[PDB]
Design a protein. Structure first.
Length: 352
């Protein structure tokens, strides 16, 4: 039942909604969610493509924007920034109730910038200013250029959702870039206590890529095992003396966020990823149908750290089979960028 959302918050995990639309906000639905255990919102270009195509409240906005001399991208941004700013206002009470530790809304930069660090910084700074809300995160793909940009954006005081992570190695690189940006602010006497970063580590895509060719005992297991191992890495990194020295001065830890947590194989229970990945100081962003399913028949238990030995043994067998999870992660990140760019191009065409 609905109280499962509060039970998960007591276990130290925030549940966010991986969807956004003009009607979700305007109808009052988002505000009602924020009073009843949803703690944040994520978007991406596919989410906006579907919202713009299906939500009747965009029609008049598009008609208005087509009367102006604006590029398709500008029309999209005017729409999306307005939705994000409105959602930020809905989430502000929650955000301020935790001292700025919850209640975030994420907006992603253009996919075509993913391998351009300077262009990413420029767009992220601009979108941060355009939204004009303390509880907005700019979503940036975790390519090498994105990790370069992360360091700069953190040093600028901007909260960031680093997305399309599938790799423990790339995640650790992100933590190091974050720490460098925080250290640069502390050295300059600037505040750090309101800078928040999430590392959005994608789940279902790993199982989708591997399961058809895995043995029986591994089908549907690899994504969860990787996530468990990533969380162990997180505990080690952020408790080390180097980070503790920053946290003592007000720095916030990055938090792992489980994304792509809708189940995509009907052979697995629809709450598998949410149920299996609950642990302290994490986030799980879920699509509507998965949120529904979790409220109806999910389970709130601290599962993320259970059976870490089995996760290690499974990852050793994945390697034994010749699956290089770092090679896989790069291909999945590439896949995901292509897919997001395809969605973005699909949403721009009706805005010409």
């Amino acid at each position: 039942g609905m109280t499962i959302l509060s039970d998960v918050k007591a276990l130290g995990q925030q549940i966010w909604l991986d969807n956004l639309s003009r009607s979700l906000v305007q109808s009052g639905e988002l505000a009602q969610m924020l009073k009843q255990g949803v703690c944040g919102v994520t978007s991406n270009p596919a989410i906006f493509q579907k919202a713009f195509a299906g939500d009747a409240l965009y029609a008049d906005e598009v008609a208005a924007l087509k009367r102006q001399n604006l590029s398709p991208k500008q029309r999209y941004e005017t729409m999306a920034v307005a939705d994000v700013r409105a959602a930020c206002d809905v989430c502000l009470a929650e955000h301020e109730s935790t001292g700025g530790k919850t209640g975030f809304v994420s907006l992603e930069v253009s996919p075509e910038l993913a391998k351009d660090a300077q262009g990413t910084v420029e767009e992220a700074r601009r979108l941060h200013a355009a939204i004009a809300r303390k509880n907005a995160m700019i979503k940036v793909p975790a390519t090498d250029a994105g990790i370069d940009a992360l360091e700069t954006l953190v040093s600028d005081g901007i909260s960031v959702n680093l997305t399309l992570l599938f790799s423990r190695a790339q995640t650790l690189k992100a933590y190091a870039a974050y720490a460098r940006g925080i250290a640069k602010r502390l050295a300059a006497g600037q505040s750090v206590a309101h800078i928040q970063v999430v590392a959005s580590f994608f789940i279902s895509r790993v199982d989708s890529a591997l399961d058809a060719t895995l043995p029986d005992r591994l089908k549907g297991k690899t994504a969860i095992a990787l996530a468990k191992a990533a969380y162990q890495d997180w505990e080690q990194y952020f408790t080390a003396p180097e980070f503790a020295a920053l946290e003592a001065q007000g720095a916030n830890r990055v938090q792992l966020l489980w994304a792509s947590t809708g189940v995509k194989n009907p052979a697995y229970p629809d709450t598998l990823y949410v149920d299996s990945l609950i642990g302290v100081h994490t986030v799980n962003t879920v699509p509507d149908a998965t949120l529904k399913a979790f409220i109806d028949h999910g389970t709130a238990k601290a599962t993320l750290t259970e059976s870490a030995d089995e996760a290690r043994a499974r990852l050793a067998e994945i390697a034994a089979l010749g699956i290089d999870v770092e090679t896989l992660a790069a291909r999945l990140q590439e896949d995901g960028l292509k897919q997001f760019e395809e969605a973005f191009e699909k949403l721009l065409a009706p805005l010409v």
